A paper describes a structure:
The serine palmitoyltransferase ([name]) complex catalyzes the first and rate-limiting step in sphingolipid biosynthesis in all eukaryotes. ORM/ORMDL proteins are negative regulators of [name] that respond to cellular sphingolipid levels. We determined the cryo–electron microscopy structure of Arabidopsis [name]-[name] complex, composed of [name], [name], SPTssa, and [name], in an inhibited state. The [name]-[name] complex is a ceramide sensor in the ER that controls cellular sphingolipid homeostasis.
During structural determination, a clear lipid-like density was observed in the cytosolic membrane leaflet sandwiched between [name] and [name]. The ceramide is presumably derived from endogenous ceramide copurifying with the [name]-[name] complex. The small polar head of C24-ceramide forms potential hydrogen bond interactions with the side-chain groups of Asn17 in [name] and Tyr55 in [name] and the main chain group of Ser67 in [name]. The aliphatic sphingosine and acyl chains of ceramide are coordinated by numerous hydrophobic residues from both [name] and [name]. A hybrid β sheet, formed by the amino termini of [name] and [name] and induced by ceramide binding, stabilizes the amino terminus of [name] in an inhibitory conformation. Unlike either of these, the N terminus of [name] (residues 5 to 8) forms an antiparallel hybrid β sheet with the N terminus of [name] (residues 1 to 5) in the [name]-[name] complex structure. The potential acyl-CoA binding pocket in the [name]-[name] structure is partially shielded by Met14 and Asn15 from [name]. Our study demonstrates that upon ceramide binding, the N terminus of [name] forms a hybrid β sheet with the N terminus of [name], thus stabilizing the Met14/Asn15 of [name] to limit acyl-CoA binding. The WT [name]-[name] complex represents a ceramide-bound state and has a decreased Vmax and an increased Khalf for palmitoyl-CoA compared to the ceramide-binding variant [name]-[name] ([name]-N17A), indicating that the ceramide binding can repress [name]-[name] by mixed inhibition.
Author numbering:
A (entry chain C): 1 to 48
B (entry chain B): 1 to 36, 41 to 475
C (entry chain D): 1 to 156
D (entry chain E): 36 to 62
E (entry chain A): 63 to 480
Amino acid sequence: MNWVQRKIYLYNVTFGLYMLDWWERYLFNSLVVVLMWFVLYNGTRYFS
Amino acid sequence: MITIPYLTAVSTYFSYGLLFAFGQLRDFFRRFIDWWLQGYAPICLGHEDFYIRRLYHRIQDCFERPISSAPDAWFDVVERYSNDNNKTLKRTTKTSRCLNLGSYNYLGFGSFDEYCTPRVIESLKKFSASTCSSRVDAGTTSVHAELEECVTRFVGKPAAVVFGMGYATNSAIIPVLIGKGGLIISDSLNHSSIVNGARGSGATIRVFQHNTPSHLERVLREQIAEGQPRTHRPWKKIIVVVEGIYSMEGEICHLPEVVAICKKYKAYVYLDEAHSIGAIGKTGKGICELLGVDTADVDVMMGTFTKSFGSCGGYIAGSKELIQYLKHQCPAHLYATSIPTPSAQQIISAIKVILGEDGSNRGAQKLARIRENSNFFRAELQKMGFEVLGDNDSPVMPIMLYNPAKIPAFSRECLRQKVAVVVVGFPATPLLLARARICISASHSREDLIRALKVISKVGDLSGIKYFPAE
Amino acid sequence: MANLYVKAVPPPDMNRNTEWFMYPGVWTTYMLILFFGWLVVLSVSGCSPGMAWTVVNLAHFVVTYHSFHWMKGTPFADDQGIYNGLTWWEQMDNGQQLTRNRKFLTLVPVVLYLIASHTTDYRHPWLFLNTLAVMVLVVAKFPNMHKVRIFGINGD
Amino acid sequence: GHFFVEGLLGVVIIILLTRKSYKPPKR
Amino acid sequence: PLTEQEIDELCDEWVPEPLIPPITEDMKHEPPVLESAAGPHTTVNGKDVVNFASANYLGLIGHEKLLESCTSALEKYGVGSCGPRGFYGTIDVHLDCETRISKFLGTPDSILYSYGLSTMFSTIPCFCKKGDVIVADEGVHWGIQNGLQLSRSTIVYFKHNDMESLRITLEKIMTKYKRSKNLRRYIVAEAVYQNSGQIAPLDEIVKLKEKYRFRVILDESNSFGVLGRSGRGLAEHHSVPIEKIDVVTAAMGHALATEGGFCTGNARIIDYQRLSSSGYVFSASLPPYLASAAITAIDVIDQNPDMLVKLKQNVALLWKGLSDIKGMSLTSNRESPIVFLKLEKSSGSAKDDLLLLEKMADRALKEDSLLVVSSKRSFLDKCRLPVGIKLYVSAGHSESDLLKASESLKRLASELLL
Ligand SMILES: CCCCCCCCCCCCC/C=C/[C@@H](O)[C@H](CO)NC(=O)CCCCCCCCCCCCCCCCCCCCCCC
């Protein structure tokens, strides 16, 4: 395992995604990737 | 009592909320799927066992692992498969060879030694296993009358009675001593047998902070002054129940500071030497010898032969007229079947080894070897940054995890590298405190401990369970 | 990456259902879950903050009323069924009223209703709903409405 | 119609943040 | 409020009760210490005596083929279990025993318990909660009536073996709860009663429960391996499918010469008791050598169905000899192997009848070498059935020792009771 492959693994155990099933884990991962793009774009452009 | 890293105590509640929100969505989308048993009522409501199908079924391969060898330092683990969409694990051939770290033989008597097996086997071909009767009918053999004298010499007290179960030694004896109109100040963390034992009578139950005597006295004062709940009558009895070593906390009781408080308020003490009857003490005589406390200060003493002596059973020690009363009124002595003969012959011949009456000198090496291993293993984990509980001498050392998703991650990554451990979850322990239990015996060599340590250190880097600073 | 330790002391309780609420971090997570949801509804479906604070207040009333004032009993068979006729709210704090934890749970739906009204200029299509929530949610957390059922609904 | 509600709840909020915790009644 | 000095007196004027009551002179009598096993012909104080107090019905104590199977599993696993079943206390022999029992009885699944007497404390409280109804039998042994109290539910009793008093109770239960329909109802019985020696009629019990929608829990430890024509149990006796009985528990410390218990039944009820019991998830499992002998003992029962027909002959030969007794009267059944003998015409009081019975059981062994068992009730037992002496006849008893127990029991009651 390289560095990112270990940080992704550490992210899974701390937030409880290691236990969920293949769709449950993909339904929450996809909903967090959309909230990270709506903050970057908006937040760094709607203020400054 | 348990320092919790604040930031790790916020991601634990967020992980349990994700397992609850995703568990209530699959229940409402399954209640509508029952539109596509004969007149009776369901053996359980859907909302009853919610944490047995939405939490325990996700990690069921970390429990009930079958083995096909004696509970030794090394044993064989049977590999199972999921077959039908992960619902019924079925076992195969193709065992493994792991390093036993989740059993209980502290002194290493649960295997095959050159002094007990030969004697136990020779006494089973003369009495033949069980005797099919009670102890007041036909169940008192010569081996049952000689085993009640060995336990009286070991423990120290003037009399003793041995039973066939360690869990029925607390549900069938507390109702005899106290009833309706009495009080039981129990410690918070007591075994379920004690609790069920207090609920078997009409006695009221209270609870004082785990292992702090300054709260026991404040609980006793209120109860003695106040009286019985509704009708303010004075209690007729008070009994205080404590434990020698509190397992899953690895804590040795503050027995001298609990004896002196109960001795002033006229209460009775009830000791529970389940985990500390062959493990701690310079001669294996328990916590009354390690802490140096008079043995006549405690009224009743209960114990168990399952963990140190490698044989099922239990005992109660007390004064000579307490045993005479129990033998005549206890329900586990009048109705239950006597302890099997080869299970009682393995306690006599194990006690004769610890006391050094076997001719050899290998009874003190166990007691010496079990003190080093537990001290060297616990001192090597603290310097690596782990959070291990215990004092200095108890051979139980829980490692805190705090996250429900680190239970399978810690067990499955240790089994892959051939180390076997035990993990405990939320329905059992409190929501925030999940941990792993490590048992160190007197049969592990130093090389085995070194190998196990270099694996536990490597797996704690991935999961990041090194909550403290290293060195 | 680890600091700020707290030696959480163990209380009495003896009820696995409602004893987890005394440990440290239960308030900072109740507010973090309300903020995380707000941002999750403002991004998946582009809206205004006022229309996001109303959906976070309406969804929080359906998830709290069915958990705190509907389901009775405990999901653990360990205690047989001693509390077979007590809603989580009635089990909380062994019957004690107006405690430190009962004051925070009663002051969360009120403060979450003042933010969903002063960010939507009141109006009338949303002021009704946001007024039915608090009314029905605060009335149930009264010290007098203990073990009382309206017209014998869900009480035997 | 916008200040009579925010002005009243602050009064009600102070009322329960000062009450004394008491045991339930007896039989 | 009481001051912290007013409190200090109330803790000084308080004086507690003694831990135990004073020990009397009639509260101490040591039982016999026997040597060389415990079969039909045992040994006490040198002299050879006749055993009638051990509950081995099939005569498997000391069997040649049980010792060879205990030794092999005792030299391989050890004498201890080390740990619970939920951790690392699950050896393969434990799984093979549960597979063999269910194949013997013809049932999907099975479960093992460590102690024989503790298979009813965790089997009753685990099914009934604090809001259900139980209809017990008012003559059930302590083990069963302790699990009835552990499960905080509503217990209603009925007359001993009176199916007329069962219908009356069921009718009144199905009216006092006409509104509720969530309520779970259970009927708790016992195949061959220990305190009376009567055999339950499983013809009306499974016909009355199929009209009121109840559930049955049979505790058949005194019938499993002896009552049926093939040794299946009570079900075979009354010829009823073993599927109508929802739960079937038994103890293996009777006709199996081992220790432990089990609980047979469907798969949805067996696996639910695995993850939510009390004496299964909080106690050490069976030692492997004790569970490796039950497997051997079950095969002996299958391969030899004649040592059952030889048990009926023994009980019918000891029933025809005690048909003359004056002081007492056979109050048991006729096919059950627990010949009871309640004493006709109560001499003294409750504690006076239990002293005259224990003195007659002591003289029987101290004169002509006979071990018999008499009723022993504690203050926790809530049974009110008549007291008496019992004889656990076996299939290994001879014809000479079977007639030597009726002669010394008929001449010992005549010169005492009367
Ligand atoms: C996806 C992120 C969160 C999404 C929703 C998750 C929050 C739901 C928490 C519900 C709390 C349940 C309280 C009592 C429920 C009882 O009924 C049941 C059965 O009786 N007891 C039990 O299950 C035993 C108690 C243990 C339950 C563990 C759940 C606690 C996990 C989080 C606790 C602290 C975080 C939330 C505190 C309360 C939040 C209230 C819900 C917030 C509204 C969300 C809507 C945006």
